[PDB]
Amino acid sequence: GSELSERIESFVETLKRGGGPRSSEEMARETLGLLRQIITDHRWSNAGELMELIRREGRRMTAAQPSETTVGNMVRRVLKIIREEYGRLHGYAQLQSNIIEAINELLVELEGTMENIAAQALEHIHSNEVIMTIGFSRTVEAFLKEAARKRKFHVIVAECAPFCQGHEMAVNLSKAGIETTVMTDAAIFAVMSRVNKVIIGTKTILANGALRAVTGTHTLALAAKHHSTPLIVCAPMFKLSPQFPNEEDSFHKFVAPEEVLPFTEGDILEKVSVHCPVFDYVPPELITLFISNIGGNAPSYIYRLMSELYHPDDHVL
């Protein structure tokens, strides 16, 4: 029994500080493992009692690091599934195993969302082209070195400044013969006139397509609203959340100011109130086309998907 609590605390701790799980796939995957553990190794007479319990644990897991909602939306989807099974068995005996098999279905789908996106890629790209991304998401690099083995475009990645994270992609993709050009984020607009389309990742897709991406992308969304080049948002379906943009703006992830202004700077750090957010909000209207493991979609379909998966009552989680 206590093994439950110890893996809970390990998860919460490695959530508060732990770098890695890297790909949000992996974060959701270990979240789902912990979910299975909780949902087999505890006591509950009615199913509503398990709803309440997992609601408690998800509330703690999200209010731990609210900057990351992959774990939160995983909890909400699991609560949807228990709602489903209770409805099916109400209109109690062994529904536990039904839960577990539905969760295994969810997990095997999760394990292949990346290849779904990969297979959906090549219907959007064609040669003699130039594409621009931002930051680094595993989904986008899968996308690109997937479309690379059929034809050779010219990717232009803009390294984020608070972390030269995009740098890594520009190395990785350089290992498929893909014509990667690394530009400094500031210079986005300086080449925005020769980027036929942009492919941006995320870490959330709020309830109206207003994604929240790595910093240095609201500028990208605006410079691509300007030139009317389109935003391919390569967001695997599990990254949503039923939360809406205007919420208390504890919304970015204010990382340590050592990234921008090193400590070895000197005295000037007396009153220089440095800042460093790593999440730029993006509004819906700039978002052209969502991709997902289902197919292609429009920023207006995201509300349909949110009413689809997460039962609209448990948004408060």
Binding site: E123, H124, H126, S127, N128, K197, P230, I232, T288, L289, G295, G296, N297, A298, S300, Y301, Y303, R304
Partner: protein
């Protein structure tokens, strides 16, 4: 099986992945004369797809369904085969023949997908001829109650958005809009019509005549002058070839630019389309899914000289003319359909289900 048609000369660098077909070197030059390797209905329907005798979307879908019905009720079962398999296997090469002849629209693909679902939905408990007549009546009842009753409901709806006095702008041989006008004009509402055509497949003249012969004051003018009449125009009534997943209404090569200058002068666009022209792929820009009809017809007789006689003997020259452009869902303001009136950015959330 079926041979392949040649490419006609140089393509556009950006459009090399799309075919530069030709409506002169028809495939039927090298098939079986009393067509057996190919059905007669399919060789004929393809042959008259290459001679342009079918132009619109509803027209192509109906011609396809008629020829496929002529295939169905003239088909006997090979030894020990359930219809659901041998029939769709018989169907596949004919659809490949058509797609080789003239790349299919969204209406052809919608009808083909529905017909595959139907051929596979037939059962083993039903005998050959009885279930064959069942599938025949199924094709018929679909082609009735999802296109013609559709257009009639579209009329019953659109009649509301045509008040007395306001002119209306249209485009080309889109049968649905001509029916909309000639159906909402008899019931009393009075207006004008400003047809707009393009080149070299000048196709506004069709709705032009079908409007003259209905007592509706028209006025025809090429699209490089649309920017002129948009001051007066109070509604644009576009014919919508194929809705898409995101909302981007794909239509003829003008529709997009027309809606562009239309929203520029701020006139409310209205594309009219039925609930089966909804091939639910997506296409962001105007390039990821088009065709290229025979481009060697863009030229024009000008006095004595035609400026492109030797189309090929100028190497670095290349020609093209798309046959499909796309209006993004920002511009368009109506999708009139048999579900009612729905804003264009809400196509999928009501037509996916």
């Amino acid at each position: 099986q079926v041979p392949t048609r040649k490419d006609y000369g140089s393509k556009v660098s950006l459009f090399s992945h799309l075919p530069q077909y030709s409506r002169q070197n028809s495939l039927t030059q090298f098939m079986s004369i009393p067509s057996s390797v190919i059905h007669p209905a399919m060789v004929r329907l393809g042959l008259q797809y290459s001679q342009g005798l079918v132009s619109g979307s509803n027209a192509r879908c109906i011609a396809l369904l008629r020829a496929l019905q002529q295939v169905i009720q003239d088909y006997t079962t090979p030894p020990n085969e359930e219809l659901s398999r041998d029939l769709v296997n018989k169907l596949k090469p004919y659809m490949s023949f058509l797609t080789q002849c003239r790349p299919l629209s969204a209406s052809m693909h919608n009808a083909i997908k529905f017909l595959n679902k139907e051929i596979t939905s037939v059962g083993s408990s039903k005998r050959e001829e009885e279930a064959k007549s069942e599938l025949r009546a199924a094709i018929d009842r679909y082609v009735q109650e999802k296109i013609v009753l559709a257009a009639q409901a579209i009329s019953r709806f659109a009649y509301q958005k045509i008040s007395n006095g306001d002119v209306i702008l249209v485009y080309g041989c889109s049968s649905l809009v001509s029916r909309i006008l000639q159906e909402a004009w008899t019931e009393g509402r009075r207006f004008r019509v400003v047809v707009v055509d393009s080149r070299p497949w000048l196709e506004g003249r069709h709705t032009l005549r079908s409007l003259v012969h209905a007592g509706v004051p028209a006025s025809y003018l090429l699209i490089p002058a649309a920017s002129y009449v948009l001051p007066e125009v109070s509604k644009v009534l576009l014919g919508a070839h194929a809705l898409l997943a995101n909302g981007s209404v794909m239509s003829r090569v003008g529709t997009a630019q027309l809606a562009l200058v239309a929203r520029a002068h701020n006139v409310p666009v209205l594309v009219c389309c039925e609930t089966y022209k909804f091939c639910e792929r997506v296409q962001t820009d105007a390039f990821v899914s088009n065709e290229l009809d025979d481009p060697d017809d863009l030229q024009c007789k000008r006095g004595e000289h035609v400026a492109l006689a030797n189309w090929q003997n100028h190497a670095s020259l290349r020609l093209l003319n798309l046959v499909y452009d796309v209006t993004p869902p920002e511009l368009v303001d109506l999708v009139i359909t048999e579900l009612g009136m729905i804003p264009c950015s809400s196509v999928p959330v009501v037509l996916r289900v």
